[PDB]
Amino acid sequence: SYTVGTYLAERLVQIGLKHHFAVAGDYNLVLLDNLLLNKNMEQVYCCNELNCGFSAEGYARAKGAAAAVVTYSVGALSAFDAIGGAYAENLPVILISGAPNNNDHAAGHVLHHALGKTDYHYQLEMAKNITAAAEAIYTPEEAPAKIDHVIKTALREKKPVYLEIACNIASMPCAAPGPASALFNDEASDEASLNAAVEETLKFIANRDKVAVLVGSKLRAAGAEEAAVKFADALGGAVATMAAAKSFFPEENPHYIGTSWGEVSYPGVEKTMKEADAVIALAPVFNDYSTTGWTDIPDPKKLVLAEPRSVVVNGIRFPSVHLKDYLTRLAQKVSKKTGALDFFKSLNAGELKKAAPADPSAPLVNAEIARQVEALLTPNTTVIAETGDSWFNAQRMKLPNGARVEYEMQWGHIGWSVPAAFGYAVGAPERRNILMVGDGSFQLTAQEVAQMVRLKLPVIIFLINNYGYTIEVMIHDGPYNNIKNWDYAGLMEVFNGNGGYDSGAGKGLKAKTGGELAEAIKVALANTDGPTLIECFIGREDCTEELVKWGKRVAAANSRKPVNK
Amino acid sequence: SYTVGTYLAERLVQIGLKHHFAVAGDYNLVLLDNLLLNKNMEQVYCCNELNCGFSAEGYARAKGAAAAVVTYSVGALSAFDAIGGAYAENLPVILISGAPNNNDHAAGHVLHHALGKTDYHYQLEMAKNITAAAEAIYTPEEAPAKIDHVIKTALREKKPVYLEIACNIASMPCAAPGPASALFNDEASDEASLNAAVEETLKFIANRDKVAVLVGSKLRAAGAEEAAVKFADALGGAVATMAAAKSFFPEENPHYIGTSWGEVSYPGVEKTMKEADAVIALAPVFNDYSTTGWTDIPDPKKLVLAEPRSVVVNGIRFPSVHLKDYLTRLAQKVSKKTGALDFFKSLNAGELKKAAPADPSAPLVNAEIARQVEALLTPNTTVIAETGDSWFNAQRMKLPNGARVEYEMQWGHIGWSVPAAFGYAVGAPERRNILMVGDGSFQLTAQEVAQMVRLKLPVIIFLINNYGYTIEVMIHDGPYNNIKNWDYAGLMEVFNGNGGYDSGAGKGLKAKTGGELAEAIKVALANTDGPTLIECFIGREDCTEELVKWGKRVAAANSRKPVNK
Amino acid sequence: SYTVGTYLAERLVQIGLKHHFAVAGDYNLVLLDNLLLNKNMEQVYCCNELNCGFSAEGYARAKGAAAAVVTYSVGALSAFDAIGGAYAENLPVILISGAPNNNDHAAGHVLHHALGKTDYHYQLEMAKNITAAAEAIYTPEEAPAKIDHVIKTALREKKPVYLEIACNIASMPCAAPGPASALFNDEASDEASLNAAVEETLKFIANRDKVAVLVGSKLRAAGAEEAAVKFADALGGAVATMAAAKSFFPEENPHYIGTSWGEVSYPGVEKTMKEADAVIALAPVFNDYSTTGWTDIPDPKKLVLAEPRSVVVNGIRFPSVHLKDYLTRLAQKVSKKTGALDFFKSLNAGELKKAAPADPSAPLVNAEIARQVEALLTPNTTVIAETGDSWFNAQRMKLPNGARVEYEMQWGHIGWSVPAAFGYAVGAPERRNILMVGDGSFQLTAQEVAQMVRLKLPVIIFLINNYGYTIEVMIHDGPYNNIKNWDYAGLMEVFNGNGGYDSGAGKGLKAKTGGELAEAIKVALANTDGPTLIECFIGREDCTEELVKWGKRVAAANSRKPVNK
Ligand SMILES: Cc1ncc(Cn2nnc(CCOP(=O)(O)OP(=O)(O)O)c2C)c(N)n1
Ligand SMILES: Cc1ncc(Cn2nnc(CCOP(=O)(O)OP(=O)(O)O)c2C)c(N)n1
Ligand SMILES: Cc1ncc(Cn2nnc(CCOP(=O)(O)OP(=O)(O)O)c2C)c(N)n1
Ligand SMILES: [F-]
Ligand SMILES: [F-]
Ligand SMILES: [F-]
Ligand SMILES: [Mg+2]
Ligand SMILES: [Mg+2]
Ligand SMILES: [Mg+2]
Numbered sequence A, B, C: 001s002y003t004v005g006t007y008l009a010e011r012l013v014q015i016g017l018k019h020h021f022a023v024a025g026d027y028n029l030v031l032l033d034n035l036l037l038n039k040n041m042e043q044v045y046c047c048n049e050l051n052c053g054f055s056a057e058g059y060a061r062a063k064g065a066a067a068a069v070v071t072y073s074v075g076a077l078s079a080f081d082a083i084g085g086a087y088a089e090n091l092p093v094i095l096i097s098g099a100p101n102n103n104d105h106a107a108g109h110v111l112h113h114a115l116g117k118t119d120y121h122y123q124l125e126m127a128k129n130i131t132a133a134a135e136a137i138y139t140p141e142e143a144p145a146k147i148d149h150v151i152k153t154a155l156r157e158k159k160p161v162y163l164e165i166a167c168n169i170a171s172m173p174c175a176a177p178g179p180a181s182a183l184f185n186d187e188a189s190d191e192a193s194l195n196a197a198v199e200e201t202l203k204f205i206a207n208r209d210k211v212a213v214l215v216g217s218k219l220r221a222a223g224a225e226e227a228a229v230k231f232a233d234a235l236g237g238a239v240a241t242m243a244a245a246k247s248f249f250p251e252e253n254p255h256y257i258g259t260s261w262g263e264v265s266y267p268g269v270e271k272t273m274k275e276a277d278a279v280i281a282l283a284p285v286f287n288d289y290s291t292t293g294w295t296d297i298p299d300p301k302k303l304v305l306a307e308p309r310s311v312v313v314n315g316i317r318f319p320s321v322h323l324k325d326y327l328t329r330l331a332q333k334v335s336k337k338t339g340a341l342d343f344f345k346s347l348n349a350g351e352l353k354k355a356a357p358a359d360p361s362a363p364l365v366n367a368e369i370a371r372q373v374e375a376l377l378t379p380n381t382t383v384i385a386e387t388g389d390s391w392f393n394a395q396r397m398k399l400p401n402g403a404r405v406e407y408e409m410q411w412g413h414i415g416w417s418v419p420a421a422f423g424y425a426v427g428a429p430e431r432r433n434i435l436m437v438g439d440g441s442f443q444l445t446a447q448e449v450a451q452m453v454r455l456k457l458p459v460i461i462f463l464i465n466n467y468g469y470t471i472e473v474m475i476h477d478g479p480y481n482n483i484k485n486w487d488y489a490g491l492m493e494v495f496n497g498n499g500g501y502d503s504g505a506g507k508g509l510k511a512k513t514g515g516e517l518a519e520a521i522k523v524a525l526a527n528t529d530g531p532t533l534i535e536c537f538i539g540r541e542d543c544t545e546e547l548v549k550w551g552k553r554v555a556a557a558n559s560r561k562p563v564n565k
Helices: A004-014 A029-036 A049-063 A076-088 A122-127 A140-157 A191-205 A225-235 A269-275 A323-333 A339-346 A366-374 A389-395 A417-427 A439-454 A488-496 A514-526 A545-559 B004-014 B029-036 B049-063 B076-088 B122-127 B140-157 B191-205 B225-235 B269-275 B323-333 B339-346 B366-374 B389-395 B417-427 B439-454 B488-496 B514-526 B545-559 C004-014 C029-036 C049-063 C076-088 C122-127 C140-157 C191-205 C225-235 C269-275 C323-333 C339-346 C366-374 C389-395 C417-427 C439-454 C488-496 C514-526 C545-559
Strands: A019-022 A042-045 A066-070 A093-099 A134-137 A161-166 A211-215 A238-242 A256-260 A278-282 A303-306 A310-313 A316-319 A381-385 A404-406 A432-438 A460-465 A507-511 A532-537 B019-022 B042-045 B066-070 B093-099 B134-137 B161-166 B211-215 B238-242 B256-260 B278-282 B303-306 B310-313 B316-319 B381-385 B404-406 B432-438 B460-465 B507-511 B532-537 C019-022 C042-045 C066-070 C093-099 C134-137 C161-166 C211-215 C238-242 C256-260 C278-282 C303-306 C310-313 C316-319 C381-385 C404-406 C432-438 C460-465 C507-511 C532-537
Touching: A004 A029, A004 A140, A004 A161, A019 A029, A019 A049, A019 A417, A029 A042, A029 A066, A029 A093, A049 A066, A049 A076, A049 A093, A049 A417, A049 A439, A066 A076, A076 A093, A076 A122, A093 A122, A093 A140, A122 A134, A122 A161, A134 A140, A140 A161, A140 B310, A140 B316, A191 A278, A191 A303, A191 A310, A191 A316, A191 A323, A211 A225, A211 A269, A211 A339, A225 A323, A238 A269, A238 A339, A256 A269, A269 A339, A303 A323, A310 B140, A316 B140, A366 A389, A366 A460, A366 A514, A381 A389, A381 A417, A389 A432, A389 A545, A417 A432, A417 A439, A432 A439, A439 A460, A439 A488, A460 A514, A488 A507, A488 A532, A507 A514, A514 A532, B004 B029, B004 B140, B004 B161, B019 B029, B019 B049, B019 B417, B029 B042, B029 B066, B029 B093, B049 B066, B049 B076, B049 B093, B049 B417, B049 B439, B066 B076, B076 B093, B076 B122, B076 C076, B093 B122, B093 B140, B122 B134, B122 B161, B134 B140, B140 B161, B191 B278, B191 B303, B191 B310, B191 B316, B191 B323, B211 B225, B211 B269, B211 B339, B225 B323, B238 B269, B238 B339, B256 B269, B269 B339, B303 B323, B366 B389, B366 B460, B366 B514, B381 B389, B381 B417, B389 B432, B389 B545, B417 B432, B417 B439, B432 B439, B439 B460, B439 B488, B439 C439, B460 B514, B488 B507, B488 B532, B488 C488, B507 B514, B514 B532, C004 C029, C004 C140, C004 C161, C019 C029, C019 C049, C019 C417, C029 C042, C029 C066, C029 C093, C049 C066, C049 C076, C049 C093, C049 C417, C049 C439, C066 C076, C076 C093, C076 C122, C093 C122, C093 C140, C122 C134, C122 C161, C134 C140, C140 C161, C191 C278, C191 C303, C191 C310, C191 C316, C191 C323, C211 C225, C211 C269, C211 C339, C225 C323, C238 C269, C238 C339, C256 C269, C269 C339, C303 C323, C366 C389, C366 C460, C366 C514, C381 C389, C381 C417, C389 C432, C389 C545, C417 C432, C417 C439, C432 C439, C439 C460, C439 C488, C460 C514, C488 C507, C488 C532, C507 C514, C514 C532
Parallel strands: A019 A042, A019 A066, A066 A093, A093 A161, A134 A161, A211 A238, A211 A278, A238 A256, A278 A303, A381 A404, A381 A432, A432 A460, A460 A532, A507 A532, B019 B042, B019 B066, B066 B093, B093 B161, B134 B161, B211 B238, B211 B278, B238 B256, B278 B303, B381 B404, B381 B432, B432 B460, B460 B532, B507 B532, C019 C042, C019 C066, C066 C093, C093 C161, C134 C161, C211 C238, C211 C278, C238 C256, C278 C303, C381 C404, C381 C432, C432 C460, C460 C532, C507 C532
Antiparallel strands: A303 A310, A310 A316, B303 B310, B310 B316, C303 C310, C310 C316
């Protein structure tokens, strides 16, 4: 029959996992044994628990959900940083922690890995702050209900959840799981509300010809990407993406006008958004970074706010309306409103201005790196872009339909990108997976490249070595922005360990000119047996113009004086 | 248009409230003003906040949902006792607290009604422990989403929720509410799971002829009372109710065999449950009181566990199956299984043995009170039965179909019954409303009878004066079970205040014999202008036989020694 | 030897309790039995748990500390309102709750009085928000350390604490308590900091001749009342009390100039505080009520802030300086600074203007009640003054040295005064105990008068019946300020229950003229066998001039618009 552990394994298989991530500890060893009994998924090991959490996060971007398994306290508390990140980025990651023997509660027992006191609910109480559901399982009979509850909640809310399992019950018998379909069961839109929300939208734009569509970073969480295309094509209006929504709308679409990001928007976009009579915002997140330090906030008078599960339009709030349904129904009813797109074209603002191919022997510059990476983009490519100037370089790239960009702009934990690229590549081995990561970020989580070597994943890593924290320099400079340099290219042979207990086929190369970069890229594409790290050397101040402007607005918002209370 | 306050009022009207309960305080006065603008419900005032909360709880039993409005800290903290009670009893009560001016956060300001520190999230953090959803509203723009969220959650989960509203935003503009239908929008059962759960049940009872049905205290929360009757009639098996499920199944139904409550069950019931091959438990709560101190736990081998949103049967767990749907579908497919009912009849155990009419002039005894109250039961009657021997007296009463009994057996807060009877009578004025309450319990919340006088509610109160805490005496006796006696009958004229600033038509009578009780009852029935309290005098040890047996098992469970860890 | 329960009892006796307050419930019965074994204190029973908590609070005002014992969940949650109150008012009240059998943790058991789930740490987690220490005791071996910890913390911090005790361990053996002296052991002031704080104060006032002293509501918590007199006599400056500090400084002292409370100060006080060169504030609490809606905040430039355990003076913060030590040392070193007192006298502002004796047959008015109550004040009297216009009537009374006034102005829970007067009278039976309480407040907690009857306590209660909530009327008026009137005088015979199971010697009288009031007062003073309630009839708008002015400022502060963020 089933055990607590194999019940969990079966539910994970049912939601579509082909892998879960783990770091062993004595409170979870028996649990890991049970998970291993299900041959329909592989157990993937990580260097540390923060990286384990972020690997699961990256996997969820590839597959829709993920799971990480850690040990009590010492494992879970660092993983909480990654789980908070999954909550911020709307990804259903299931964190499972091993926990004390169930005899140790209310017993006056002090246990290892804990605070030295005799109670053990602190971890659960902490977890409640950063999850959509959090349950502790102390007896086998209680496991099925708690497992089903957190998994259903994760998938529905698109948020992470927490489970802890007493170490001595992992192999104990419990009931068997029913059909997978039950886990995805969700409300349909309220019919009356859906129709009313659509009708009020039509009323709102009846005499507003210049309609612009703003695509936001929760569109994928709403499962509404395809519906957004149907709507945009029916409307015939202008479509822009917010920075964190890069690749959530097809850029080869004739309605697409580029990035909307205040004073760092694509040419003509800022002016078009300003002149629009109505802005239909699809699942947006307006925060201090996306509004460019609160300088770019949509006019409440013009706004149709279509969130994942509700629409606010014409002064009325309609809960219980799913965005996918709203967009589909609206596309069927809406008439052509080309005003904003016509206006955009009338500006003749031209395309984003990009650098021409550099002299191959000249010292490498930022724009030349960005140019060569952009030339690698295919419909089958995903770029993982780290917090730092890499945000801005990726934002400038023209994507062929199908190409994806992954951003972590709400949480913004430097170092996320390395483990996330690992997890994503495990989940999407068929894709050309490219990681753009700065030297500062790389140092936080660098060891996860060794797992890429281990699993023979052909991730191409562009390590941008400008000797320090350039994004921070552009916000507020000080001695804390300087770091210790490493020989990053040489790190690959360290992780290979050829001649040691095992081996690896990773490659590390240096690029100090455009010619060297082109040669390194040829080698990277040909290396199908492991990751390739290309260490690119550029100057601290050689960064995007966009970063400079944005950083000034961010610094100003952060430092504004207290107001009179 | 709408304000934060009138938005809340409209949503409350949309879920079916015709009243809300309140106690004024400076942090909620403007909010109360806004609530008053909606003429489709009345604002009802209470003596104190604990009573306010329990009045809302009683109203929710009559109407399906309720709301109470209190002031910050001094109001909310006592109301939390009642909200905990609503959570325990599965009632959607919305607690709304006024809160500090929104300028006072992060300002280093110490405010009245608070702890003397300068932060004000402690009340919200406390509330999270005893609600299904809890939101603080600090700005008007955030109100609609938070209000909709908590209300939808309350109705779906059948649990209470918490809202706090900054005092200076109550009258500020916000969006208007959409259609009421959105608030009730819920998942349908998963089709595959529903069919599978029904099929597995049929398989389970295929070769188990003696099938008994056990009706539990969450059947009403599941909305499954009518479906339970359809299923029982199709099955033809024996049906028993758990103590707290009294009146959740029609007692004039021919399959009904009475109360199942371990050694204090109706005649023949204990033996029938024991002999059953299969027990279908419909939304049960098995706790230390309902299992008679853990002496009466259903055999896991025979159990079909049909919870409100899941079924566990034949070793398989099926989430996402609504009980109402399961019972309806099962009724259509199930064949006759009369084994347990035939067995019950074969016992010839007879009816519950009840006392004959007493000599009218003899000193009043417990059984004679119970006899005369039982004779008042009609299809249009509701009995509110307080924690104490009243639990056991009510349990012994034969209910005509339509008659209701209200119990608070999970929370079990003495004094609940007085404010709950008030709230219920406000919600169901058309019914004959009877309160059975002990002298000990009455002292905790007695002042709410004055509100019954004020609103001219013809509640009939049987105050059982046995001079102390008899239920506790029967668990573990000591000096703490003795109380100060009052002239309870005389309290009515005090609450009337005739000759004072206002007036009242309440009546208070004493009964020391069966004849005096009968006369008092005649007066009570004829008093349509206010409550009638009948003070019944009986001895401390003159209590049900059931209470004595049950109390011993409870004491034993509570005191059992720690086990080796 | 000792048990968990008798250890607790002994520690309570050691801190000076002669009584503790309790409400029985099955989770605490065995604990109550153990407490009863210690014959050096009496166990006092209450009607309900909110009242139980407030009785302990009142007792702590009389004796310095107190304890209340309640049952799990249903008892504790309401008591939390009173405990929050003790925290706000700086009183060491120990709340002890019974709790589940220690076998029921991590067992998947649902228990009565709880939420219906299988974990039981929610109550402890809630309690942490409103206490200085909170411990759960699950095993006997852990009890002594946890009991000693919370008691030491309560006494040191002058704040309430929380203990819960598993019901099945109350009678189990544990270690014996050491000497009582250990419980009071506290830090001495840091010598260098004490001397430096005194020297900096002398430097600060060296060239500031007009020095005023402002006595604050934490002076008693600091144990610094006697030291304040020594300092004031040495300084020779003007001394005013904040509203909540009434009676914390002797009013027959020649340096005392009356109440400082913004625009509702005594004559000449506001102007004297404004003209002072330096204000030495002794343990103040500046909140929205004490600053009269933020209209009366001390000038930071002139302020010497002497808190209970730190001094801020001349721009320097000195932690680890006890107020009593600071004042004593300062009194030895300080020279005469009579400037502010001379200035006050030069104003010739005269005494507070009070009404002359009324015509005995004329309709009773507020000022005439206040006049007759004031005439009852002796060096042996304590007045308990409820939130409402009673705050303002008490504030106007001239106190003979030794007379006390008790206020609850930080928490401000209406109804506090009835149970607090009960607890105080239990703790200080030797005093003339007077309760001034409004009709609105009296309704929240009226049943505790029955305990005064039971224990034969000669409390004199002036019940001011102006038919509704006058203090709220003066803040913001609406229908929520109207209440149901009772025959309050008649309530006394109800609580006596003469002719019933027991008896009582309480008396209830009505007063509608000054002559009737004088006669009722004669009777009250002669009634030594029970409480006397005098129901005084006056008009809604017949209130102090001070209340009217203050209420307008309070309303304005509460309603001020949000500021731009
Ligand atoms: C876990 C965590 N700690 C600190 C930060 C602050 N932070 N944000 N960006 C940075 C610097 C990133 O530097 P690099 O990766 O070298 O990228 P560049 O800005 O292109 O040089 C920091 C230190 C952060 N975002 N996350
Ligand atoms: C708020 C709260 N505090 C204490 C308890 C414990 N308790 N349970 N039943 C009782 C006594 C009930 O007394 P009565 O209402 O006079 O009922 P009888 O048993 O018929 O005498 C108590 C004190 C409780 N159940 N709820
Ligand atoms: C537990 C609690 N609930 C509500 C409040 C708000 N409040 N403050 N004062 C009052 C009215 C006081 O009425 P009374 O005692 O009749 O006093 P008067 O102002 O003399 O009429 C209220 C309703 C409060 N202070 N405490
Ligand atoms: F471990
Ligand atoms: F208030
Ligand atoms: F209890
Ligand atoms: Mg860098
Ligand atoms: Mg009784
Ligand atoms: Mg009043």
